[PDB]
Design a protein around this nucleic acid. Sequence first.
RNA 1: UACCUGGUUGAUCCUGCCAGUAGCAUAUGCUUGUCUCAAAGAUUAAGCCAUGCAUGUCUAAGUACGCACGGCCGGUACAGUGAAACUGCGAAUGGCUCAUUAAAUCAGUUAUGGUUCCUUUGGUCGCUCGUACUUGGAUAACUGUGGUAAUUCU
RNA 2: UGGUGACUCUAGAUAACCUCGGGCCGAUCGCACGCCGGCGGCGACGACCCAUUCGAACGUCUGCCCUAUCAACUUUCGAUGGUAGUCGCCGUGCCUACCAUGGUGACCACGGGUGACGGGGAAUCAGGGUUCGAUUCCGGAGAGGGAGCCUGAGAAACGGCUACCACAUCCAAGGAAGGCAGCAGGCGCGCAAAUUACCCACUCCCGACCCGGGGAGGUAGUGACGAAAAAUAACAAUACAGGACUCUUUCGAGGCCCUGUAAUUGGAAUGAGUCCACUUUAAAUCCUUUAACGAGGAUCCAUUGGAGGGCAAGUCUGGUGCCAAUUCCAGCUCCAAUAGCGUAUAUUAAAGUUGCUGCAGUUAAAAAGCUCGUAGUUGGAUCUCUCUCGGCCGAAGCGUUUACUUUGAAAAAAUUAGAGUGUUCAAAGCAGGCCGCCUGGAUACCGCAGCUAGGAAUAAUGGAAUAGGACCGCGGUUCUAUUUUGUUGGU
RNA 3: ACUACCGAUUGGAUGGUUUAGUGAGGCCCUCGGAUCGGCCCCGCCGGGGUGCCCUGGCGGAGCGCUGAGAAG
Lengths: 262, 50, 180
Amino acid sequence: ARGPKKHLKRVAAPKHWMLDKLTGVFAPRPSTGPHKLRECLPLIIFLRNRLKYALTGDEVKKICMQRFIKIDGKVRTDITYPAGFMDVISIDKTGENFRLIYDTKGRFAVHRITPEEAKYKLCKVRKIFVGTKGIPHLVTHDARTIRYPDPLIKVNDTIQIDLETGKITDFIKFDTGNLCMVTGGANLGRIGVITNRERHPGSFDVVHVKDANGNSFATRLSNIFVIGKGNKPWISLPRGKGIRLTIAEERDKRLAAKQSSG
Amino acid sequence: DQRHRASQLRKQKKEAVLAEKRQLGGKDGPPHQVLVVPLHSRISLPEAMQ
Amino acid sequence: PVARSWVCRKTYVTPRRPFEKSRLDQELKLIGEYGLRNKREVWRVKFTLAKIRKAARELLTLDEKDPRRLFEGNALLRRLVRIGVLDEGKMKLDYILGLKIEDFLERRLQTQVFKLGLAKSIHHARVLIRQRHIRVRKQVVNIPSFIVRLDSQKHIDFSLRSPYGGGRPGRVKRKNAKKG
RNA sequence: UACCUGGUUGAUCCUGCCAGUAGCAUAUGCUUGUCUCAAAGAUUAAGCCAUGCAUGUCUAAGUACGCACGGCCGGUACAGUGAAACUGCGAAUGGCUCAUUAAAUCAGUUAUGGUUCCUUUGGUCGCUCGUACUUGGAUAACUGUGGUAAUUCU
RNA sequence: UGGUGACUCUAGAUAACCUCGGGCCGAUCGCACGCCGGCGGCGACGACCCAUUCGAACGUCUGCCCUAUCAACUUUCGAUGGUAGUCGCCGUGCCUACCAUGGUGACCACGGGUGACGGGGAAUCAGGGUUCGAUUCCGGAGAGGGAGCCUGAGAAACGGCUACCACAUCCAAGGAAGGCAGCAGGCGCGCAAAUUACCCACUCCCGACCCGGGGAGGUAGUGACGAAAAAUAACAAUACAGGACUCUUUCGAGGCCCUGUAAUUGGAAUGAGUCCACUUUAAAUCCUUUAACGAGGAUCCAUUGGAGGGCAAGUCUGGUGCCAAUUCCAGCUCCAAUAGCGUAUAUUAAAGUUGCUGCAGUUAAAAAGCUCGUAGUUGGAUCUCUCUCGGCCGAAGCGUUUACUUUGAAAAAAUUAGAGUGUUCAAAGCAGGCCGCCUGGAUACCGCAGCUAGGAAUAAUGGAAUAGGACCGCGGUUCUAUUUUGUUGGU
RNA sequence: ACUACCGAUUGGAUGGUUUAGUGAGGCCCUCGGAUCGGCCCCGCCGGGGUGCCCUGGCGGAGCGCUGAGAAG
C-alpha cells in the first residue's frame, strides 16, 4: 500500500464481533481511538448487532446524531468509535448503562449495570514517566494520561478513576492472592486469583491464576487486568463469573435448563 | 530471449491482421457490401432499412 | 469480492467397480423395496452410513475416558437414537458398526407414510407426499427423503387443505361434478 | 472397502509395461421439464483499444453586495434559501492483474534501547519579565473587451 | 526524581545558541444570554510538544522447485571489515576519503532455468506421500517499457506531472491531446470465458457532512463450471399367470387370499404450462401464497453410450462387394446410468511402476578384473544439587555441553473436523425458542523453527597419567578496601 | 510433385551483456534580474501644539536603500 488502509473485509474482522458471512463484503472498520482494532467493539456493532435498537447502519447513525450515546461520560457521535474493555456506555434516554467486559468465551458481554456503578472505571496503568519540571505522568490502557499520580502506583497496577473529573480515586497493586481478569490469549475472559509470577528478563513474564473452582491457568503479563483486591471484585461481574465450563458441562446445564424450563 | 522472440512473432501476426482488416471498407478499399434478408413475412423490411 | 459463500458438498459416491452383479442386485432390491427413483438415493444413504461408521471407528480408536470420545460419542448416539435408527437401550458405539442402509431407508417419509396406512403402496406414498397431501405436525412436506424423527412419527397426517384430507374437491372431481 | 477385468505361449507359471476402471480439472458433442445455490477472458497476447461511466465533498459553526429567489421596518452592516468561486479535506483507500521476483517474496518468530506517523483519544496550551474595542496588500466568482481550426487553453 | 535485564533513558543544574527559505506562546466562527465599564456557559475550527491509535520501514532466527552439459565467485567500477564524515526519518559501504585483505563455496556457492508471485488453502487418503494453488482472505508487485519528479502525513502515484523508446488520435500542417492488468463493451489470440442493463435500498468507504457521492458494493441479464432437492404417473375392477392356506391320496374346488402382466375398462389426485391478485423489491423479477383454465396414446411422447473376443449386455435381420467364407451401410434385441450421458487432454488413485514406510539386480531391465585407497555414513561391552544474605523458603553458581522427550505461554479469519439449530428436506445458513421473556453464535486441529520449565533411558562430547589433580589449612609477592583514624592534612 | 535439413548474402530488422563517446528531462548549487512594491527627496496641498514637526490622496526623477521575483 501507499498509505493507511481504510477498509475492513468482513471475513477479516475480529471473530469475537460475531459477524455473519453473507450480510456484506465489508466490516464496520473501527476508527482510530483509545483501543486497538482487534480488541474493540465499534459502536455500530454494539448498538445494532447486540442491542438491536437499530436494524441498519443508517439508523445507527440516526441514533448517534441525536446525541443519545455516551462512552465514559462523553457524547460520542462517531458510529465506528472504538470502545473497549471497562468502558461505560450510557444511554440516558432509555436510562440504561453497560460495561464492556468479556464473556468466559472471549466476547463482549451485554452487561447491564447500576447508574451508581456507571460513575467510575478501572484502568490498567501501562507506563509511568517523568516529564518537564519533574512531573510524574501515568499512561493507562485506554490512552489516558494522568498528571501527578500517587507515588505508590507502579506499572501493571489498576486505578479506579472517576469519569466526570478524570482523577484517580483508588488503586490496586499487582500482587499474588489478588483478583484478575484475562484480557488476551486463549484464557480471555476468565476471572481468578493471582498465585505466581515467573519473571523472564528480556522476554515476557508469565502470571499464574487460580479459578474459584480450583482450575489453574497461566497467561502473559500483558494479558492480566487486576479487577479486585484479594478476592472481591471492584466491579459487577457478568452472569458467568469467569468460570469457563467445559463443553460437557455446557451440554449438561443446557439439558437441565431444558428439562426444568419445559 | 524467449520473451523477445514471442514479441517478434506477435508483432508479425498483428501487423498482418491489421493490414487485412484495414483493406475492407476503408478509404483505400472497396465498400463493405451488406445484404439484408428478412426471414419472416411479419418482418417490416422498410422499417429496418430506415 | 462478493457476499456469497461457495461451500457445497457432493452427497454420494459412485462405486469403484461399475458392473458387479451382487451390488446391482442389492441396489435394485432396495429401490424396489423402498420406491426410490434411481441408484443415487441408494448411494446417498450408503454415503451417510459410511460417514457415520468412519466417525464411530475414529472415536473407538480413542481410549475409554477420553473427553472427546465421551462428548462426540454421546452426540452421535443421541442423533442416531433421535431419528430412530438405534434403539434407546443400545447407547454403545460398537452397535453403530452393526447398522445397515435399510434402517435409514425405513426412516424416510415415503416409508413412514406407507406404514401409517395413509397410502396403499410405497409408490402411492411417494406420489402422495410429492403432491402436497402429507403434513408432518402442521407443515406440508414435499420431500420423500425427509427423515422422520421419533417425536415426529406420531404427528404425520393428511394436509388440512388436501381433497383426501380437509375436503375441498380436486380439479378432476370439480370438473366432472359440474357436467350434470 | 488398503477391490479388481483383460492383453506375449501350442498349453502352464512368471517378469514387465499397457488397456479398461475411479476422482479432479479444462474443452467439446448429443440431450434437457421444475426448483436452490453458484464459478465464469487466468492458461494463448503484463496483446491493442471506439464509446459511456468508475472521485467527490457544506454544517448553527471559514468567505454571500449573483434579486437566482425571498419577509421586514424602514437610517438598523448582515432575515432566510442559496448557484458560482476562493479556502479546507479526500483523491496514497477501494478495484484489477500475476509480468517480474528463487533466501528475494512469503509464513512463523522476534526488535526498534535505531525511526516516522494525517487523523482519533488523553495531557499541555496567563509556566516566557519583554491599532489591540482589531492590522496590511491583494486575488477569484461577478462586469466588460478578446485571441486561436482545435483542449477541462486562456 | 522515576524506570529497565541492560541507556549515552527520563527528569535536574550551569554556559550559551536559536537558521528571515523564521517553532510554540489563538487578530477565527456559531448558540444561549446572565451577573456586579468589569466579570462569564456551552460548543466549532486551528495548534508546538508528549502519549495513544492506524500503520509504515528497516533488521533477527528457521524454512523453497529443477539444473555440474554451471566448480570456483565477489574484489580496478564496493567486494568483506575499521576510523572519520556525507546523505537519510533513522541503524548500516547507503555514499565518500584513507587504511586492512578480506567475504562465499561439493552442507552445492556462483550461474542458468521454471508452462514460479508467496502463504491461508484444494484433490486424493489406512498411513506416508503425490499433484494443484493465475483466482474473491492476508502479504508482495505493476499500471505499454524504462527513467525523473510535484504536492502531501503518506506516492517515486500513472482515472498526477515531465522526458525518452514503442505505439497511436485530431489538424486549416502552424499546433493539440494520449495510456480499460477498473465496470461494461470491441478487435486480436485461440480448445477456451457473460450485459456497452438498474440502484446507492443493503454492506461499508470518503467529504466541511444525519442531507452529497461511490461500475467499491448490491440487483437483475447470459450461465448443463460445479454442488443441493427433485416430476415424466398412482389406484380400483375385470381377464390370464404364478405363489401360499382350508378341504381332498391326488386330479381338483376355493365370491380364500397375496403378488405380476394388459392393443381392457373406470373416474380420483395433481403438477409442467397459461394467467388475476397479493407478497417480494430501491423499482422489479424469481421463489413462496392464492383465484380461473390446465391430462389418456395422460402425443404434456428421455436421452446418452455400449454390447454377437473378457467386467453388464445376442444362437438376430436386410442390402453391398471378394473368393460357403467374407470389406462397406442401415436396422431389431439386450445392458448401464439417468436430466443427464459420451469424447479429447492433463493429472491423481489402483501402483510396492520411484519404493522413508515399501521395489529390485544367477537365469527376465540391472553388481564393477582384483586389492589398496579421502570425505561422508555406521560403529562391541562397561560408570546407581548446593553455597550465601533477607521472610521451613526466597534470590545466586547451576550440574560438562548437546541431540531426544514432555509441559506451559503464545500462535488471522474463511476452509476442514465437529457441537447446537425441522433451511418444508437437503446443499447451506447462523440462526432461533416460549407466552415481553429465554437463548446461541461452541470445541478441536494448527509441520518446523523459536521462547518455557521438567525428564535423564538412548547416542555423542569433556573432566587426574611428563601430575604445574582436587580438598584443606600455614603462608610469601603484586594489585586491590569506598570505609570502624568527630570536621579534617594523613607516610 | 511433396516432406524435411545446410546455406554464401557484414542480406535487412530486432533484443541482451558490455568498450568508447554523446546524452533529453527533472532535482540541487552559483549566478542572472524581465517586472512589481515600499522607504528617503520634492511639488499640489489640509491642522495643532504656537515657520520645528508630523497627519493623509496623487504626481516627479534619483543603478540611493532595498524586498519579492519569471525567462535564461
